[PDB]
Amino acid sequence: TSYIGGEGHNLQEHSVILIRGGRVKDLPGVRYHTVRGALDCSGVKDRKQARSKYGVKRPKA
Amino acid sequence: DRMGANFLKVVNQIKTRLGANPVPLQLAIGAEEHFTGVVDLVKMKAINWNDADQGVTFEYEDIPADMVELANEWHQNLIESAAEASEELMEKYLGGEELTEAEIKGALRQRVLNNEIILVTCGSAFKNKGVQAMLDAVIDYLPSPVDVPAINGILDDGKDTPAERHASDDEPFSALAFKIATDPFVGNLTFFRVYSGVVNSGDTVLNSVKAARERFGRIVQMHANKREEIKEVRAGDIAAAIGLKDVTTGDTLCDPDAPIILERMEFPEPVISIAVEPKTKADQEKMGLALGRLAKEDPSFRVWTDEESNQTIIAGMGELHLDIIVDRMKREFNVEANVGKPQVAYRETIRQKVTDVEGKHAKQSGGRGQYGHVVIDMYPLEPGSNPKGYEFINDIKGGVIPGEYIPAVDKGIQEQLKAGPLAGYPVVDMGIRLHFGSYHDVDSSELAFKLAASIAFKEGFKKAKPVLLEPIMKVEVETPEENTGDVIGDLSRRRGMLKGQESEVTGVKIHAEVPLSEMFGYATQLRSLTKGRASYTMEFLKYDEAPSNVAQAVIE
Amino acid sequence: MKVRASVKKLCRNCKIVKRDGVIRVICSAEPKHKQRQG
Amino acid sequence: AKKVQAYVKLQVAAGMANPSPPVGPALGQQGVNIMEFCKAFNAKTDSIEKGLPIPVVITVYADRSFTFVTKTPP
RNA sequence: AGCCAGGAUGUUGGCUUAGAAGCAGCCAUCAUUUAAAGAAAGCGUAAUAGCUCACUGGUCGAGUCGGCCUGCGCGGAAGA
């Protein structure tokens, strides 16, 4: 099982995604996160700072 | 060589239909059985050939009497065309001057390079005749890389510095990738046409078309399917590059600070639309992959991830186009696909107007409990483009619904708003109102109010005996002039609603509104009804009244 | 061709012929009007 | 007079120009252009009045020379 | 009855303004040019165009046509 961190998503039942660990400490059973912007996933829209993770590109600014 | 073959018939059709101003620089010698060669209308001589086939050796002959009268006729009309866009050679014709054969050979060549008239020649490839004469014309009348003006283009910057793609062997390196096809035994064989410049096998080139920077692996040339490696990439030629990634179909490669002379060409329409289902979803991953590398090399082929039904949609150009594509999968790509059909976009809507439906939720049993009791007025809203698909208005005046609960109650309605209990589909055009309610102290939480209104939603929904709504997708077509009615009736039968039709340049444009569900593979039908001389586009227009019969049918 | 057991005139072009005792309707225009004995 | 070349009963309202969508094949089913029809319409129909529903005679020749003669609103 | 003829104007007459224009129907079911012609019986049209007919001119040269009442027949009518 995996957790789609960040804000919302666009994934449904097909999307091929890359997985890394990291327990949510909150939802038992979950043991893994889903890398945003990885192989099928969209990097979050408008993530100004700490944008390295969430695969949010350097702003055009 | 076949029964009913008339040369002259074509030289008329090419005008009556295409208007190419034919110049039959060729003319045969005989009918089905009697075809025995052609008459060369540049030297006024005729050619006879060897035994029936094999085109062993040419027999250099003259004009036989049976056609001499005719050949001279068309000739004077042929040389009448020897000068029609040029005053110098015009007086040659005006004075009837015996213009030099080899000269007038090039006079028309100018016109063909001017792209006005075309060589019209006759021969039987199956009988080996007429072909050789044609091949000679391929030289004596066809252009070369230097015979065409160096194409104008852009550079990379704003003004784009309109350039010319000189085929000179000193012009900076430039070439476009027109074909993309991965070979099984070798690799991703990419084809490209050398436009300008040269290089040995292997150079780092700036693909300014997409702003890329690549290399060159082996520079092999495809005879037909046999790998022929080359080193010098000579200007003006064609060959197949290998070992590249970023080079999508239709991309120009230029390394020496010589940006692209780019042009775009591929813009057809994936008219045919189907869905496909792989067996054993593990086969779905590879299908996602196979289609990925597949659907990228071929341009006009598209794939969608349906935002409504999450169906893998194939988008293709023609009936056969999809047929071969999937044929490729199972065969050479190892992919078993079951061809399905598109899903729908049905929407739930309430027909009538409710009046007082109330939703109560009380479960005490002791301890902590929940309580809720509201009333609503769900009304068929105008199916307007107001983003508020449902329109809701607070209507508690006495202060009997504490502020906290509003977001809660509306969520209860809005959560059930996209389930449309009648058929599981989403809901639209709803004039919902909140006119009265009643809250219990502490035992009432936000939770109970989400429920109560949802259930309240249901009875009024059930008291509204809801109706469906298919999506209506606008349609515009094009059929010359003779299929007018035949196309319309076809559309009429499809449960469409005609909405206007016009006459133009050479076609009849018709505007209609027909349910999308009936467009399953319409395109092929139209081409059949119009000798393939017709096509259309179709895009969303609105959701409209569902058909009663299908309403009870569409139900799973 | 219909074998309706009761023949009738459908249009102008329809006409009755008593070939063989069999009643026949022949249509000079519409071959669908062509039925046999009734 | 002119036999079957192009004769059609039309022009309900002579108060609009460029009758592309509404008319189109109304006379276009046979041989007439739209852009020039209204340009021809301007030629004589704006002198009587614009707005009234006037009826006109559609006359067309195979020599690709279309013209008309106006009447009074029925 | 056949053979040569014709079979018109406002007029696309509204509306449900998509458009039913003699030909989907509702409405009316006009008045004129009138040897005659209905603002229409039928074939043909998304809606037109198109092809004929009623009625009427001549020819031609004599009987012709539609119901009612009954007689006797035909079809309906396929088994080991």
User: Are B310 and A16 within 8 A, CB to CB?
Assistant: no
Q: Which two structure tokens, joined as six digits, stand for B196?
A: 């300008």
Are A20 and A33 within 8 A, CB to CB?
yes
d(CA B494, CA B295): 31
B305 touches chain A (CB under 8 A): yes
For B523, other C-beta atoms within 10 Å of its C-beta total 20
| Cα angle, residue B325 at apex, residues B319 and B328 outer, rounded to 5° | 140
**Chain B partners of A42 at a C-beta cutoff of 8 Å?**
none
d(CA B450, CA B415): 9
d(CA D33, CA B267): 30
**Chain B partners of A14 at a C-beta cutoff of 8 Å?**
284, 288, 305, 310, 312
Breaks (C-N over 2.5 A) in chain C follow: none
Strand partners, B474: B513, B539
d(CA B440, CA B424): 33
- Crossing angle for the helix pair B522-529 and B484-493, nearest 10 degrees? 150
- How far: D31 CA to E3 C1' (Å)? 38
d(CA B497, CA B513): 5
Q: Is the CB of D26 under 7 A from strand E?
A: yes
d(CA B39, CA B28): 6
**Chain B partners of A13 at a C-beta cutoff of 8 Å?**
310
B484 touches chain D (CB under 8 A): yes
**Chain D partners of B508 at a C-beta cutoff of 8 Å?**
25
**Chain B partners of D34 at a C-beta cutoff of 8 Å?**
503-504
Are B274 and B313 within 8 A, CB to CB?
yes
User: For residue B371, how far is the Cα from the chain centroid?
Assistant: 58
Q: Is the CB of D4 under 7 A from strand E?
A: yes
Total tally of structural domains belonging to chain D: 1
- How far: D67 CA to E72 C1' (Å)? 74
Nearest Cα to B377, choosing from B466, B468, B464? B464
Q: Is the CB of C31 under 7 A from strand E?
A: no
* Contact residues of A toward B, CB < 8 A: 12-14, 16
Q: Which two structure tokens, joined as six digits, stand for D23?
A: 């008319």
Nearest Cα to B443, choosing from B332, B516, B368, B515? B368
Helix or strand run (H / E) with residue B379:
strand B379-380
Nearest Cα to B258, choosing from B338, B215, B197? B197
Are B328 and B420 within 8 A, CB to CB?
no
d(CA B521, CA B513): 16
> In the block, which residue shows the tokens 């041989």?
D31
Q: Which two structure tokens, joined as six digits, stand for C23?
A: 């009643």
Nearest CA in chain B to D19: B502
Q: Which two structure tokens, joined as six digits, stand for B545?
A: 């009244």
d(CA C31, CA B538): 41
Q: Strand locations in B114-196, DSSP E?
A: 174-180, 190-196
> In the block, which residue shows the tokens 């008239």?
B117
For residue B371, with 0-12 CB atoms within 10 Å meaning exposed, 13-18 middle and 19 or more buried, which class applies? buried
Are A45 and A16 within 8 A, CB to CB?
no
Range of the domain at D8: 1-71
B501 touches chain A (CB under 8 A): no
Amino acid at B265: M
d(CA D56, CA B438): 71
B503 touches chain D (CB under 8 A): yes
Q: How far apart are the first and last CA of chain D?
A: 24
D74 touches chain B (CB under 8 A): no
Q: Is the CB of D25 under 7 A from strand E?
A: yes
What CATH number is associated with residue D25? 3.30.1550.10
**Chain A partners of B291 at a C-beta cutoff of 8 Å?**
none
Which of B305, B308, B311 should be substituted to probe chain A, the one whose Cβ sees the most A Cβ atoms within 10 Å?
B305
Nearest Cα to B470, choosing from B521, B509, B519, B400? B519
Measured between alpha carbons, how far is residue A19 from residues A23, A24, B190, B288 in Å? 12, 14, 34, 19
Are B306 and B315 within 8 A, CB to CB?
no
> In the block, which residue shows the tokens 């206007």?
B500
Nearest Cα to D59, choosing from D70, D48, D51? D70
The pairing of beta strand B251-253 with beta strand B312-316: unpaired
Task: Count Cβ–Cβ pairs < 8 Å, chain B vs chain D.
Answer: 21
- How far: D60 CA to E21 C1' (Å)? 20
Nearest Cα to B477, choosing from B518, B515, B510? B510
- How far: B486 CA to E24 C1' (Å)? 20
User: Which among B288, B310, B312 has the least Cβ separation from residue A16?
Assistant: B288
* Secondary structure (DSSP) of D7-60: EEEE-S-TT-S--TTTTTHHHHTTT--HHHHHHHHHHHHTTT-SSS---EEEE-
For B503, other C-beta atoms within 10 Å of its C-beta total 23
d(CA B190, CA B219): 10
Are B312 and B287 within 8 A, CB to CB?
yes
d(CA B423, CA B469): 11
Return the half-sphere exposure (C-beta side, CA atoms, 13 A cut-off) of residue B26.
Answer: 24
Q: Identify the sign of the CA torsion D20, D22, D27, D31.
A: positive
- Contact D/B (≥3 CB pairs under 8 Å): yes
Look up the protein residue whose alpha carbon has the minimum distance to the C1' of E10: D74
B500 touches chain D (CB under 8 A): yes
Give phi and psi for B392, each to the nearest 5.
-125, 140
Nearest Cα to B133, choosing from B47, B24, B44, B15? B47
The pairing of beta strand B272-278 with beta strand B337-340: antiparallel
Q: Which two structure tokens, joined as six digits, stand for B87?
A: 């005053």
d(CA B81, CA B465): 77
Resolution for this experimental structure (Å): 3.2
d(CA B426, CA B408): 20
Helices (H) and strands (E) in chain A, counts: 0, 2
Are B537 and B476 within 8 A, CB to CB?
yes
Amino acid at B510: I
D73 touches chain B (CB under 8 A): no
Nucleotide nearest C37, from its CA to each C1': E75
CA of B502 vs chain D CAs: smallest distance (Å): 5
| Cα angle, residue B264 at apex, residues B259 and B269 outer, rounded to 5° | 160
Helix/strand/coil percent split, chain B, to 5:
25, 25, 45
User: Are B484 and D29 within 8 A, CB to CB?
Assistant: yes
**Chain A partners of B310 at a C-beta cutoff of 8 Å?**
12-14
Are B36 and B123 within 8 A, CB to CB?
no
For residue D37, with 0-12 CB atoms within 10 Å meaning exposed, 13-18 middle and 19 or more buried, which class applies? buried
User: Which among B285, B288, B310 has the least Cβ separation from residue A12?
Assistant: B310
User: Are B310 and A13 within 8 A, CB to CB?
Assistant: yes
